[PDB]
Amino acid sequence: VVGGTEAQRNSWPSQISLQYRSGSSWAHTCGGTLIRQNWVMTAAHCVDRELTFRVVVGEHNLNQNDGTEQYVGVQKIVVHPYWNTDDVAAGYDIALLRLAQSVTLNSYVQLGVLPRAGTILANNSPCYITGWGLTRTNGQLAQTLQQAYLPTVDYAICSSSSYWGSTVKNSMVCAGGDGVRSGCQGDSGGPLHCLVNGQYAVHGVTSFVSRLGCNVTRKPTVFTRVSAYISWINNVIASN
Ligand SMILES: [Ca+2]
């Protein structure tokens, strides 16, 4: 997250760190959202590589003992069947991870609430992106979980020529684009939390930013629209 602030440790308890094994250690690669005690929602592109993955819930600082973490292996990966890694613009950037164990819930570890199917946010709706992704274009991962206020940019504006044009689909949410705040590499797969009727819900799964840079004006961060995938999510969980 470029232009973020450090999140309070109990603000976003559904945020997870998706990590891969690298040598004798683990490296953060993506975010995710805990959606059942044994299921995480993330981006399909996060799991394109044939890696050993684990999830950390109750994570705040990637580089220090928080005293709240639970580390759990990924047991099964179910990528959306229409995902194509060389066509992120087509959409379908979503995957579910079944965890090896059911995590224990507490103020640091909670299920993310998803919107009702079909819900589309009005332009300029209030949301926060969260994650450990780069803090500058071509920068480095954050140590502490970051948040940035990224209001939505509706489909009509987001798909206009000076924004994303044809690249954005109605199955996506755009947010931000102010040239200061954005998602960045390593935020992918994590939530866009939007405040509606007094409650935050996870309306987005971080999918892409401009190839030119993270915080590029009129290139808002683009998210998979969770509310387009409610039936898909429920079907996968019911069948697994
Ligand atoms: Ca930690």
Short mmCIF file of all heavy atoms in Angstrom, two decimals, residues 2 16 26 39 42-43 46 50 57 71 78 80-81 87 101 112 130 132 134 166 173 185 189 200 203 206 211 215 219:
data_model
loop_
_atom_site.label_atom_id
_atom_site.label_comp_id
_atom_site.label_asym_id
_atom_site.label_seq_id
_atom_site.Cartn_x
_atom_site.Cartn_y
_atom_site.Cartn_z
N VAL A 2 0.70 2.02 -1.04
CA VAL A 2 1.39 3.32 -1.14
C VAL A 2 0.52 4.37 -0.48
O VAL A 2 -0.70 4.35 -0.67
CB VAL A 2 1.63 3.69 -2.60
CG1 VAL A 2 2.40 5.03 -2.69
CG2 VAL A 2 2.36 2.57 -3.36
N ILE A 16 -5.40 -11.76 6.03
CA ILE A 16 -4.36 -12.79 6.23
C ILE A 16 -3.16 -12.44 5.36
O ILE A 16 -3.25 -11.68 4.39
CB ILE A 16 -4.89 -14.21 5.99
CG1 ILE A 16 -5.19 -14.57 4.52
CG2 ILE A 16 -6.16 -14.42 6.81
CD1 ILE A 16 -4.02 -14.82 3.62
N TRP A 26 9.96 -18.27 5.09
CA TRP A 26 8.69 -18.01 4.45
C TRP A 26 8.68 -16.57 4.00
O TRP A 26 9.19 -15.69 4.71
CB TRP A 26 7.59 -18.23 5.47
CG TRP A 26 7.39 -19.67 5.86
CD1 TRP A 26 7.98 -20.30 6.91
CD2 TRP A 26 6.63 -20.66 5.17
NE1 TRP A 26 7.62 -21.63 6.94
CE2 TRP A 26 6.78 -21.88 5.89
CE3 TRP A 26 5.78 -20.63 4.05
CZ2 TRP A 26 6.11 -23.04 5.53
CZ3 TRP A 26 5.11 -21.80 3.69
CH2 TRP A 26 5.30 -23.01 4.44
N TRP A 39 -11.22 -21.54 5.42
CA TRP A 39 -11.19 -21.10 4.05
C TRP A 39 -10.74 -19.65 3.95
O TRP A 39 -11.26 -18.78 4.66
CB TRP A 39 -12.54 -21.20 3.32
CG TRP A 39 -12.98 -22.57 2.97
CD1 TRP A 39 -13.79 -23.39 3.74
CD2 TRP A 39 -12.67 -23.29 1.80
NE1 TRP A 39 -13.98 -24.56 3.09
CE2 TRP A 39 -13.32 -24.53 1.90
CE3 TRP A 39 -11.92 -23.02 0.67
CZ2 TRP A 39 -13.26 -25.48 0.87
CZ3 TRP A 39 -11.86 -23.94 -0.34
CH2 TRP A 39 -12.53 -25.17 -0.23
N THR A 42 -8.63 -15.33 -1.90
CA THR A 42 -7.51 -14.57 -2.39
C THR A 42 -7.66 -14.41 -3.90
O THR A 42 -8.71 -14.70 -4.47
CB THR A 42 -6.18 -15.26 -1.99
OG1 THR A 42 -5.08 -14.39 -2.23
CG2 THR A 42 -5.96 -16.56 -2.69
N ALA A 43 -6.62 -13.86 -4.53
CA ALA A 43 -6.60 -13.71 -5.97
C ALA A 43 -6.06 -14.97 -6.62
O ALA A 43 -5.10 -15.55 -6.11
CB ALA A 43 -5.73 -12.51 -6.40
N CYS A 46 -2.29 -14.97 -7.36
CA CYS A 46 -1.42 -15.20 -6.24
C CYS A 46 -0.94 -16.64 -6.14
O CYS A 46 0.09 -16.90 -5.52
CB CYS A 46 -2.10 -14.83 -4.93
SG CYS A 46 -2.28 -13.05 -4.74
N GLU A 50 3.73 -22.74 -8.51
CA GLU A 50 3.63 -24.04 -7.93
C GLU A 50 4.38 -24.16 -6.60
O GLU A 50 5.18 -25.06 -6.39
CB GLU A 50 4.18 -25.05 -8.92
CG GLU A 50 3.44 -25.11 -10.27
CD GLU A 50 2.11 -25.90 -10.26
OE1 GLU A 50 1.85 -26.68 -9.39
OE2 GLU A 50 1.35 -25.63 -11.18
N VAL A 57 -2.88 -16.01 10.01
CA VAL A 57 -3.91 -15.19 10.58
C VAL A 57 -3.38 -14.55 11.84
O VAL A 57 -2.42 -15.02 12.44
CB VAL A 57 -5.22 -16.01 10.88
CG1 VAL A 57 -5.69 -16.69 9.62
CG2 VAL A 57 -5.03 -17.02 11.99
N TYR A 71 -0.30 -19.98 12.30
CA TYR A 71 0.28 -20.33 11.04
C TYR A 71 -0.32 -21.63 10.58
O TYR A 71 -0.33 -22.63 11.35
CB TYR A 71 1.82 -20.55 11.23
CG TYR A 71 2.54 -19.34 11.81
CD1 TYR A 71 2.70 -19.17 13.17
CD2 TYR A 71 3.04 -18.36 10.97
CE1 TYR A 71 3.29 -18.02 13.65
CE2 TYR A 71 3.66 -17.27 11.43
CZ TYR A 71 3.79 -17.08 12.78
OH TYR A 71 4.45 -15.92 13.22
N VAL A 78 -8.50 -23.92 -4.87
CA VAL A 78 -9.53 -23.95 -5.90
C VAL A 78 -9.56 -22.58 -6.58
O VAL A 78 -10.03 -21.59 -6.04
CB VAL A 78 -10.92 -24.30 -5.35
CG1 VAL A 78 -11.88 -24.40 -6.50
CG2 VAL A 78 -10.92 -25.60 -4.59
N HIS A 80 -10.71 -20.04 -9.67
CA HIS A 80 -11.85 -19.90 -10.52
C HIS A 80 -11.57 -20.56 -11.86
O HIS A 80 -10.54 -20.31 -12.46
CB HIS A 80 -12.21 -18.44 -10.77
CG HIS A 80 -13.58 -18.31 -11.33
ND1 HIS A 80 -13.87 -18.63 -12.65
CD2 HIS A 80 -14.76 -18.09 -10.71
CE1 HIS A 80 -15.18 -18.56 -12.81
NE2 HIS A 80 -15.74 -18.19 -11.67
N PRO A 81 -12.47 -21.39 -12.37
CA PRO A 81 -12.15 -22.16 -13.59
C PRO A 81 -12.03 -21.35 -14.87
O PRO A 81 -11.46 -21.86 -15.82
CB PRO A 81 -13.31 -23.14 -13.71
CG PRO A 81 -14.32 -22.67 -12.85
CD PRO A 81 -13.72 -21.83 -11.76
N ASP A 87 -4.30 -13.10 -18.98
CA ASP A 87 -5.41 -12.21 -19.31
C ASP A 87 -6.10 -11.73 -18.03
O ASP A 87 -7.27 -12.03 -17.80
CB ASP A 87 -6.36 -12.97 -20.20
CG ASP A 87 -7.39 -12.12 -20.85
OD1 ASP A 87 -7.50 -10.88 -20.60
OD2 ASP A 87 -8.19 -12.76 -21.62
N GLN A 101 -5.99 -26.77 8.95
CA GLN A 101 -6.66 -26.72 10.21
C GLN A 101 -7.65 -25.57 10.19
O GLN A 101 -7.49 -24.60 9.46
CB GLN A 101 -5.65 -26.46 11.33
CG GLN A 101 -4.74 -27.63 11.64
CD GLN A 101 -3.53 -27.77 10.78
OE1 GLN A 101 -2.80 -26.80 10.55
NE2 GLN A 101 -3.26 -28.98 10.31
N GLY A 112 -14.31 -12.49 7.42
CA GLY A 112 -14.74 -11.33 6.68
C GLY A 112 -16.14 -11.46 6.22
O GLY A 112 -16.53 -12.49 5.75
N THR A 130 -6.21 -2.82 2.54
CA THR A 130 -5.22 -3.19 3.54
C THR A 130 -4.22 -4.16 2.96
O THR A 130 -4.55 -4.96 2.07
CB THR A 130 -5.89 -3.73 4.81
OG1 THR A 130 -6.74 -4.85 4.53
CG2 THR A 130 -6.73 -2.64 5.48
N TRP A 132 0.28 -5.68 3.16
CA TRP A 132 1.70 -5.53 3.39
C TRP A 132 2.48 -5.25 2.14
O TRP A 132 3.70 -5.33 2.12
CB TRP A 132 2.28 -6.76 4.10
CG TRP A 132 1.82 -6.98 5.48
CD1 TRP A 132 2.40 -6.50 6.62
CD2 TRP A 132 0.73 -7.80 5.94
NE1 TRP A 132 1.72 -6.93 7.71
CE2 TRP A 132 0.69 -7.74 7.33
CE3 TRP A 132 -0.22 -8.56 5.28
CZ2 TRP A 132 -0.27 -8.41 8.08
CZ3 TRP A 132 -1.15 -9.25 6.02
CH2 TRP A 132 -1.17 -9.18 7.40
N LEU A 134 4.05 -3.31 -1.36
CA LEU A 134 5.06 -2.27 -1.43
C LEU A 134 4.50 -0.94 -1.02
O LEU A 134 3.35 -0.57 -1.32
CB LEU A 134 5.61 -2.10 -2.80
CG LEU A 134 6.14 -3.32 -3.54
CD1 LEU A 134 6.73 -2.92 -4.89
CD2 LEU A 134 6.93 -4.28 -2.79
N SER A 166 -11.24 -0.36 -21.67
CA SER A 166 -11.79 -1.68 -21.80
C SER A 166 -11.27 -2.70 -20.84
O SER A 166 -11.84 -3.75 -20.70
CB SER A 166 -11.54 -2.19 -23.29
OG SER A 166 -10.10 -2.45 -23.57
N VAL A 173 -14.16 -4.00 -9.17
CA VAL A 173 -14.32 -2.73 -8.48
C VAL A 173 -13.06 -1.94 -8.65
O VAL A 173 -11.99 -2.47 -8.45
CB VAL A 173 -14.58 -2.93 -6.97
CG1 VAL A 173 -14.73 -1.60 -6.27
CG2 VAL A 173 -15.77 -3.74 -6.71
N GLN A 185 2.43 -4.03 -5.28
CA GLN A 185 2.75 -5.45 -5.33
C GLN A 185 2.84 -6.02 -3.92
O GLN A 185 3.49 -5.47 -3.05
CB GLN A 185 4.02 -5.72 -6.13
CG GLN A 185 3.79 -5.61 -7.63
CD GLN A 185 3.66 -4.22 -8.16
OE1 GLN A 185 4.04 -3.26 -7.52
NE2 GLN A 185 3.13 -4.07 -9.39
N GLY A 189 -4.73 -10.03 -3.74
CA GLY A 189 -5.43 -11.07 -3.03
C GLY A 189 -6.10 -10.60 -1.78
O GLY A 189 -7.01 -11.30 -1.27
N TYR A 200 -18.49 -2.61 7.72
CA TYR A 200 -17.51 -2.89 6.66
C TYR A 200 -17.76 -4.31 6.14
O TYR A 200 -17.91 -5.27 6.90
CB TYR A 200 -16.12 -2.81 7.20
CG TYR A 200 -15.58 -1.41 7.27
CD1 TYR A 200 -15.58 -0.70 8.48
CD2 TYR A 200 -15.10 -0.76 6.17
CE1 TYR A 200 -15.14 0.60 8.54
CE2 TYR A 200 -14.68 0.54 6.25
CZ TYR A 200 -14.66 1.19 7.40
OH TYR A 200 -14.20 2.49 7.44
N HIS A 203 -15.63 -5.99 -0.27
CA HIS A 203 -16.19 -5.87 -1.59
C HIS A 203 -15.22 -6.20 -2.70
O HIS A 203 -15.63 -6.42 -3.83
CB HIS A 203 -16.74 -4.44 -1.82
CG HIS A 203 -18.04 -4.18 -1.14
ND1 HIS A 203 -19.21 -4.00 -1.86
CD2 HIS A 203 -18.34 -4.09 0.17
CE1 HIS A 203 -20.17 -3.81 -0.97
NE2 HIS A 203 -19.68 -3.89 0.26
N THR A 206 -7.94 -7.67 -4.20
CA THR A 206 -6.99 -6.87 -4.98
C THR A 206 -6.44 -7.68 -6.13
O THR A 206 -5.94 -8.75 -5.93
CB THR A 206 -5.86 -6.40 -4.05
OG1 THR A 206 -6.47 -5.72 -2.95
CG2 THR A 206 -4.91 -5.49 -4.76
N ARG A 211 0.87 -1.12 -15.07
CA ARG A 211 2.22 -1.53 -15.31
C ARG A 211 3.14 -0.36 -15.15
O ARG A 211 4.36 -0.61 -14.89
CB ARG A 211 2.43 -2.19 -16.71
CG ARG A 211 1.94 -3.59 -16.74
CD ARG A 211 2.33 -4.29 -18.00
NE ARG A 211 1.60 -3.80 -19.09
CZ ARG A 211 1.96 -2.93 -20.08
NH1 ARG A 211 3.16 -2.38 -20.26
NH2 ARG A 211 0.96 -2.74 -20.98
N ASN A 215 0.71 4.00 -7.59
CA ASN A 215 -0.07 5.20 -7.37
C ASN A 215 0.01 6.12 -8.57
O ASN A 215 0.62 7.16 -8.53
CB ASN A 215 0.38 5.96 -6.12
CG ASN A 215 1.84 6.32 -6.14
OD1 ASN A 215 2.67 5.44 -6.37
ND2 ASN A 215 2.18 7.57 -5.87
N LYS A 219 -5.38 5.78 -12.56
CA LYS A 219 -5.25 4.32 -12.65
C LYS A 219 -5.56 3.75 -11.29
O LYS A 219 -4.67 3.30 -10.59
CB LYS A 219 -3.90 3.87 -13.19
CG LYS A 219 -3.66 4.25 -14.66
CD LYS A 219 -4.50 3.47 -15.69
CE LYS A 219 -4.27 3.93 -17.12
NZ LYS A 219 -4.80 5.34 -17.31
#
